[PDB]
Amino acid sequence: IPGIIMPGLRRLTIRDLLAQGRTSSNALEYVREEVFTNAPGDSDITFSKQTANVKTIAHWVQASRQVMDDAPMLQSYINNRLMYGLALKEEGQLLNGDGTGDNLEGLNKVATAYDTSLNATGDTRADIIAHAIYQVTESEFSASGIVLNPRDWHNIALLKDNEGRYIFGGPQAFTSNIMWGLPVVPTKAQAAGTFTVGGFDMASQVFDRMDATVEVSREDRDNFVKNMLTILCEERLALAHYRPTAIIKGTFSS
């Protein structure tokens, strides 16, 4: 049984966008505000019974033993590599999650598509996002956080307004250099050209069932021979989507 320590990537992640929470149950139900994009009348909110189930996320990697069961490496090997990848892998689920099996019901999947019918002609990437921040209000919720890909964020970070003028400001840790006050989270999880916004603040919530724990093997598969101890680190949680209409997903159709 391993000693323990916690991790944390350089910048913030989606894990910071969703309202924190925890539980002592292997699952739990909740409700969905099926908000119809209904015309001026009875623009009411239908409801849906829905259930949330605790999933398990873990990352593994092997080593050779001894040195590990004696040197700090043991920590340096986890704190920098396992944990690093863990949280990094975590985003994928929350963001691009499949649902089936140990997969978490991804936001993008449940999130409401973008309204292309809402762009005009001389529009730029910047304009689109604006339109997005708007469609987020139709859910009776205000925008709260932006999610783009680094290769894309870097672009918007530096634009001219038909004049040398920089928008959002010059390249200043551009990500930290959050646009429109709202925070930005450029990760590898999100696809290139693909984005997702919404009121992550109230749109959905997260529950932690179990912290990140690490275990070794030395007896797995055929590792006893080649003596390649397998270290594993997992955690348990559950992602819930309350008002999917509070999140929009689109793409810069090139």
Next chain:
Amino acid sequence: PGLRRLTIRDLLAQGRTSSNALEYVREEVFTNAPGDSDITFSKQTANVKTIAHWVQASRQVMDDAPMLQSYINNRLMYGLALKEEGQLLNGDGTGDNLEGLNKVATAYDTSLNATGDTRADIIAHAIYQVTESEFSASGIVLNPRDWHNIALLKDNEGRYIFGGPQAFTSNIMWGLPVVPTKAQAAGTFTVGGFDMASQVFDRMDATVEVSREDRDNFVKNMLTILCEERLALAHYRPTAIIKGTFSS
């Protein structure tokens, strides 16, 4: 409550009372009369109507962390304000309803609509029509849709009427706070000195109740969560509130 917009409640003066009914005079000004230009009072009365929101979701709730609590306190509580603004913004004074600002509001001089005005120029003229009440404009109320357009609205000039689309964010329009919402129907707008045209009295704090036996919940195994808020709207100088819609 929520954390983003600016609840109409903030625009209207606040306060509270003990009695479930109030009395007051109404400065019903004789606005446009190039002669004796004064105001005539109209002894009115306020009715403390109780408004509330009810959500029926699952039950088990009963057996799980105060979380729920972390629910309605943070989430469901918002659902109240949104519904609250509704009644206030507008509604059939009838029954439990309050006299919506739109109901008592005044028309909008179409004569001001000069050839060449834009959907953004409209609200502008409105600001003036407010001064007619001797008062001045404090805030404007519209829906996300129209606001959106107005905000990210260029011109043949090849430029935004306001700065970049950023304008949309931090609802401020020419030093006058804006408040988009569903309560405001599409195409309809309102302006005026809400800070000083009407006062809202809070009787009792929003109270919550739960049950199933309500309707057919006993069959669904759900629970009706609701929070009732006893409020009573009151208007002083309605001529200050301007109501109108775009030409399009």
Next chain:
Amino acid sequence: IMPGLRRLTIRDLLAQGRTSSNALEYVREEVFTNAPGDSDITFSKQTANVKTIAHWVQASRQVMDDAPMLQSYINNRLMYGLALKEEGQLLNGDGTGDNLEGLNKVATAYDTSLNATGDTRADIIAHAIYQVTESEFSASGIVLNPRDWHNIALLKDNEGRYIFGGPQAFTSNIMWGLPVVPTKAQAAGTFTVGGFDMASQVFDRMDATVEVSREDRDNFVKNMLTILCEERLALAHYRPTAIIKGTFSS
């Protein structure tokens, strides 16, 4: 408090002061619009009385026990009727009985020979500022009807272009770097300009006070009260020539 001050009243435009008397004498700098020679100025042994202005709005009984909402109603709804109304006497007054010698009473007529062919509804004002300098003074600001302001601000040429116009402008209530005061106390088409900065100050004798009578006229019958906030002022004029009054050629 009276912060419906989305604008700045003349009281804020003029120069403040304070006295202890019930009346005060002063030298009226009879500035002659005299030629480039001495065009020398003259002095007049004038004086200023002290009227007592107040605003009233009858309300309903017992509003009393409810709480101090009786309170805000007063501060907020009430002053403004005070100051607003106050802004009236200051602007124009019959200078008779209880009426103060309003600026218009003493204001100097606007020269007509200055009107071109040939000049926009605003150009007229432009000329005013100049005529103001004809008294060895600058321009403090301009006072005109809230409507007329709209026409000035929201005004374009044959094409759609906001010349010094811009909803922004209306919001600012300032043009040519000069403070604009939209007050419905002054009839439309009319306008006043000058160096009020020091053209004439005001003296404060007694701050605003509140009085309520349930015995007033029909109060008893109709069954209600009548609040009343009092106030005592003293408007003075040091150089009326530094004030111009007139209307738009219509």
Next chain:
Amino acid sequence: MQIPGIIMPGLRRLTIRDLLAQGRTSSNALEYVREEVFTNAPGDSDITFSKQTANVKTIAHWVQASRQVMDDAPMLQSYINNRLMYGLALKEEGQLLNGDGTGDNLEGLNKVATAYDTSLNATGDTRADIIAHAIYQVTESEFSASGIVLNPRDWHNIALLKDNEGRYIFGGPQAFTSNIMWGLPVVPTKAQAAGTFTVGGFDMASQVFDRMDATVEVSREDRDNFVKNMLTILCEERLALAHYRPTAIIKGTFSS
């Protein structure tokens, strides 16, 4: 005459007085040097020296009134404030700006400042560009700009202006209210002529010396002001202005 002296002035606008270095003195006139900076070509771009001297002039602001009532109410206390001090302080700039430096007038900055080299501005240059050029010319003097002296009117214009894009430049009306410009303070005053602007490094350029703090005096015996029962109130100040490096200042006129 006696001295009910003590009351000081206060305005919500930054006077040129503040724009210049503050230094008191005890004399009637003093001698200093003038860094005659030659806008000399790349080589001996050295600055010549000049033996100059400044005289301590005196500014005054008066007004008549009734001794009785005046000598009877805080009006007076307040009378001098918003009327005298306000006027005097205002008139002060009249000398520190467009001074004539004759008889009792001080050597105004503008009257000394160096003209604007219209040689820099080129085609398609908004007024904003003009100022951009100005800020530079003030550098050839080895001194960086400090603040700008502009007329209220023309300030309002420059303040709010777009750029062939909905982008507002400078931020006015928000920052419009005096406040700053490009990071340099702006002193909007009536004194400053129209269309005429002046910019420079007043910070280290010129300096002002005070010989005597402003003081008021009233005389119940002036010009038959006795028989007419109407004393006279006055308020004067003794000071001197020295313009170290002229080039550190430039005066121009927008493209009218």
Next chain:
Amino acid sequence: QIPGIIMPGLRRLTIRDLLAQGRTSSNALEYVREEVFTNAPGDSDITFSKQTANVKTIAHWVQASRQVMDDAPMLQSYINNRLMYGLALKEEGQLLNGDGTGDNLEGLNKVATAYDTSLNATGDTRADIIAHAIYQVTESEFSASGIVLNPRDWHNIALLKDNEGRYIFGGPQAFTSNIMWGLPVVPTKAQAAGTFTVGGFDMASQVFDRMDATVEVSREDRDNFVKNMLTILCEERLALAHYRPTAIIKGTFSS
């Protein structure tokens, strides 16, 4: 003796900062390299190959005049902010690419996976050349981290224009930012022209530290005595690892 902290220029993040940080205590260490095959759609599984890392040493010795050692506050000033950034300026030479022989280290380029030349086109822009690199990084289902190449090449890449004065995606500023496609750039001279390296050095491999950079100085060092003067030094022990070489691409700009 015992120092406190290095602190080099920091006007650019060295590969060290690019790679994953690590710290070992043994004079040697074993690990499992993820022999990821660029295997077709099916059993695209990664074989596990056992490996071993040796703990080499590294240091810099700008020797100089025996007079340079009078003033303390000052000289410590010399090395403290002068001597490290020298060394690290160096750690590269071993980290970036090394024979991994004698006292060298397993250079990134040494184990780097050759670029797929069969990806080029008629004439992809000199920039598109790198674009393919990032794509190939997926060969090992790994998200590229940063890009390390020769400073000069960077110049040409940044300053690009079409038939018009159209500073391509790049530009003067971008160059200053040393970050394209939203990926960090380390313009170290250690790389020669036409030589580049791309991959997810973030997790592709981590470096361990055995002993902080120490300092040693002497006179008896070779011909110093005579030619009166000294010799400063900065000893440091590191160990570069590699779990999936497939996560690193080398290749060369030819043209």
Next chain:
Amino acid sequence: PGLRRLTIRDLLAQGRTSSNALEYVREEVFTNAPGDSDITFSKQTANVKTIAHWVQASRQVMDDAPMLQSYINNRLMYGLALKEEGQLLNGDGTGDNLEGLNKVATAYDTSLNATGDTRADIIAHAIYQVTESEFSASGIVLNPRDWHNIALLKDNEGRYIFGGPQAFTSNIMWGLPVVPTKAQAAGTFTVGGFDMASQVFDRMDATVEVSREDRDNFVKNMLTILCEERLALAHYRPTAIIKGTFSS
């Protein structure tokens, strides 16, 4: 005190000493081909020269005293440092002068300009040759006039290379400290990683002296004011500095 412009002194590393001279090693870094790109060493030595600023005047100012100091205080110093850059930026190693960076700087690689590069495109390439020293660029030095044009430059598309005339103020370029000083001759530039390529040591703070006894300051009522300062400039890796010019 309060100079506004950022002085070179603030662009170069700082430190002090108690000696009159210093010794070090000039990392003669050869721009050597891929192989033995090693850096040679040179036993260099720095001399703590002495610089000052003199001004003549009339004895009177000598007298109002107190004030005077209200002189040498914030007015003259400004003149000292202003001339301080002179020596640093460029000074003949001969005499009391110091090793001017330009006199120690390396030539510019014209091989980089290409038809189509704009004044600004040049200085851009310059930043590159800086990397040659294995160090990166930290700040640029141009004559006020140059910085001007360079700043609000444009192209066909009516746009500034930095989007606004303001660029001038708040000296910055691609995030690189720009120091516009008359010290730098027109049509002449200099860049590099001065931050870590050259240090300055203090041997004595600024000091002033007074004596009419100087020259003919007696026969003519006058006086020489001056403030000396003791410095020493060192150039560890000069290669980290580039210099060249433009067209005119």
Next chain:
Amino acid sequence: GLRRLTIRDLLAQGRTSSNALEYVREEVFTNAPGDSDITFSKQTANVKTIAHWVQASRQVMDDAPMLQSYINNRLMYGLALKEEGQLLNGDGTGDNLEGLNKVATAYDTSLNATGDTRADIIAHAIYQVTESEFSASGIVLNPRDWHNIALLKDNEGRYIFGGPQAFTSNIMWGLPVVPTKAQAAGTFTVGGFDMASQVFDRMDATVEVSREDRDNFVKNMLTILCEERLALAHYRPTAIIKGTFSS
């Protein structure tokens, strides 16, 4: 010496403790018989400094008896002959004073006799002075313009007024002459300087000595200086009349 303190003893003296003098200048009005009143013009007078320098040897640096004799028996006087320049012909800019000739009044030729000598002209000047309501006090001439005058011979082979015997020191028409080289030949000046103007000595004559001056230290030698700070003024410019012998 001249026994006539050059130009100095001709003007009212006084003291001052400042650097500027705001005096009232009576812009007289010759005008005509009626409003022959005199206007007033606020005028300012700056205080400039002037001194006389002389080189010496230190052997002298000792011998107060001696040195303390060289100075107040010649140095002190020598300075007067120097300051006389500013007073007489002074300019108004730099370290110069407002000389009388600069504020003087043009001579009336109108009074010249059909046929008279230079001496006669001076008389006219005296009269022209009284026009300002003020009586004349002294006269200013240039040695040579005093030479011929002292040798103005009637074709009667005899001097005018002059007789080697019948004669005294500098004096004419009852007024001093104060011959000086500082005055340009031909150009003269006359008026009631007594009240015409007055000088103010901010500080009495002060003598200082220095060695560190120039190459003296080297060429062992010394520098004695007598500093003097003063400032004069001008009341009735019409009181001073400058004339130029058209002959």
